[PDB]
Amino acid sequence: EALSDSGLPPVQRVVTGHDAHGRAVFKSEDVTPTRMIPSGDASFLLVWTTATVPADNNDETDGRQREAGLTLDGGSVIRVVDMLPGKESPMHRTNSIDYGIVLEGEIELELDDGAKRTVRQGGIIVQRGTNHLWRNTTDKPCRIAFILIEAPAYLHNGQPLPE
């Protein structure tokens, strides 16, 4: 419980579960800052993961503390990413569909060949396994919640794309 390294508020996480009596109860609650990555471009927080999709509500593991699996981008991931002003992410593609929700500020999404657009605060991105980067061209941080869900490699003319 400190301000995030981006200068934005820490994030409350509330996790539910079942007790020994099969009742729905609160499992954990915490308020935790996003923290700076080495590049200094973004401040982030992992919130949860599932080892598989479909998920397992009999898996009592804390998703924030789960050992690394096999399948790159296997299962699901929810994290919070604070893009810092004047910064951008590395361009890349993943084997997933991602739902991105702009919580605070706004963000420039750039795809292939210079294509780009702005996603305003409250906006949602459906990222369908596309090559992209995120760029903050504003003077304030932008917070985005990302949910990444396993999908096979995208098939172009029945084959994987070049990286």
Residue among 38 and 125 whose Cβ is closer to its own copies? 125
- Cα separation, 35 vs 5, in Å, equals 5
Query: Which among Cl ion, its own copies, none contacts residue 2 (Cβ within 5 to 8 A by kind)?
Result: none
Give per-residue burial for 103-126: e unless 16+ CB within 10 Å, then b: eebbbbbbeeeeeeeebeeeeebe
Q: Answer yes or no whether residue 26 interacts with its own copies by CB under 8 A.
A: yes
Amino acid at 9: P
Spell out, one character per residue from 23 to 62, where the chain touches Cl ion: x when CB under 5 A holds, - when not: ----xx---------------------------------x
Q: Answer yes or no whether residue 15 interacts with Cl ion by CB under 5 A.
A: yes
Spell out, one character per residue from 119 to 138, where the chain touches its own copies: x when CB under 8 A holds, - when not: xx-xxxxxxxxxxx------
- Cα separation, 81 vs 42, in Å, equals 7
Instruction: Single out the residue of 80, 76, 70, 71 nearest to residue 30, CA to CA.
Output: 80
Does a cis peptide bond (omega within 30 degrees of 0) precede residue 54? Answer: yes
CA gyration radius, the chain: 17
- Cα separation, 69 vs 80, in Å, equals 20
Query: Which among its own copies, Cl ion, none contacts residue 152 (Cβ within 5 to 8 A by kind)?
Result: its own copies
- Cα separation, 108 vs 120, in Å, equals 9
Which listed range, 43-51, 82-90, 134-142, lies at the site for its own copies (CB under 8 A)?
43-51
Residue 46 beta carbon to its own copies: minimum distance, rounded to whole angstroms? 11
Binding site for Cl ion (CB under 5 A): 15, 27-28, 62
Binding site for its own copies (CB under 8 A): 9, 11-18, 22-27, 29, 47-48, 50, 53-58, 63, 76, 78, 80, 93, 96-97, 99, 101, 103-104, 109, 111-113, 115, 117, 119-120, 122-132, 143, 145, 147, 149-152, 154-157, 161
